[PDB]
Design a protein around this ligand. Structure first.
Ligand SMILES: [Zn+2]
Lengths: 147, 31, 72
């Protein structure tokens, strides 16, 4: 049943690819996927490309996919283990959402970080107290790691 | 249609005896 | 066969290709259409960065398949 759902989503991404995000299988295995987020214009992560890893639970779409960053990023909501603190990946998930939709939200998260739900508080403290030192540090982190 | 090599993520081709292009050249040179 | 190349700007470019074509071949083909010298292109497919020196048959790029293009 999940094999069908995953396939459906994969057909869609071939039909209307979301301009900055790309997702697809690792090898011939449909249950493990690899995906990228192009760094958003007018954000500190601009130009950089960011590789992620998505595993679907066998009871997908009812349980959310497990998505991590493989590329390093200076963000309050993404830790060194590449874990993403997003609510639509935990409690607010709905089987009506797709991987396309989630990837865009993760992109939005790069655009507008959640400063009150911080995986790495050090970084979130800068995003409040020193907005520009954040913008400065994220740019280095985009250039060394994502270029 | 994954390449025949155990730990290879790339896709093969019948014309390359089931190997992805660079495994084929690895096979032909070893062969 | 036919493929789609989607830039971050929004515009989708349509390209006539073959399975045995290399990346250098592709990056040269978009120079013919748009005018973006091959060294300044960054091509992605379905989550994987394409590496010059490997064919499209490797990455399983088939008909109607879509490549994202980052402008370096
Ligand atoms: Zn191989």
């Amino acid at each position: 049943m999940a094999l069908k759902r995953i396939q459906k989503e994969l057909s869609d991404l071939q039909r209307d690819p979301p301009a900055h995000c790309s997702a697809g299988p690792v090898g011939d295995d449909l249950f493990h996927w690899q995906a990228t987020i192009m760094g958003p214009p007018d954000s500190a992560y601009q130009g950089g490309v960011f590789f992620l890893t998505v595993h679907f639970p066998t009871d997908y779409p009812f349980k959310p996919p497990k998505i991590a960053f493989t590329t390093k990023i200076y963000h309050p909501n993404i830790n060194s283990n590449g874990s993403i603190c997003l609510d639509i990946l935990r409690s607010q998930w709905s089987p009506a959402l797709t991987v396309s939709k989630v990837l865009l939200s993760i992109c939005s998260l790069l655009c507008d970080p959640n400063p009150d739900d911080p995986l790495v508080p050090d970084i979130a403290q800068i995003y409040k107290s020193d907005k520009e030192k954040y913008n400065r540090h994220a740019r280095e982190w985009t250039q060394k790691y994502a270029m | 249609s994954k390449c025949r090599k155990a730990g290879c993520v790339y896709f093969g081709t019948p014309e390359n005896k089931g190997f992805c292009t660079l495994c084929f050249i690895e096979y032909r040179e070893n062969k | 066969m036919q493929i789609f190349v989607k830039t971050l700007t929004g515009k989708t470019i349509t390209l006539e290709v073959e399975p045995s074509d290399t990346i250098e071949n592709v990056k040269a083909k978009i120079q013919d259409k748009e005018g973006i010298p091959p060294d300044q292109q960054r091509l992605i497919f379905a989550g994987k960065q394409l590496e010059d020196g490997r064919t499209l048959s490797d990455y399983n790029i088939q008909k109607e398949s879509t490549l994202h293009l980052v402008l370096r």
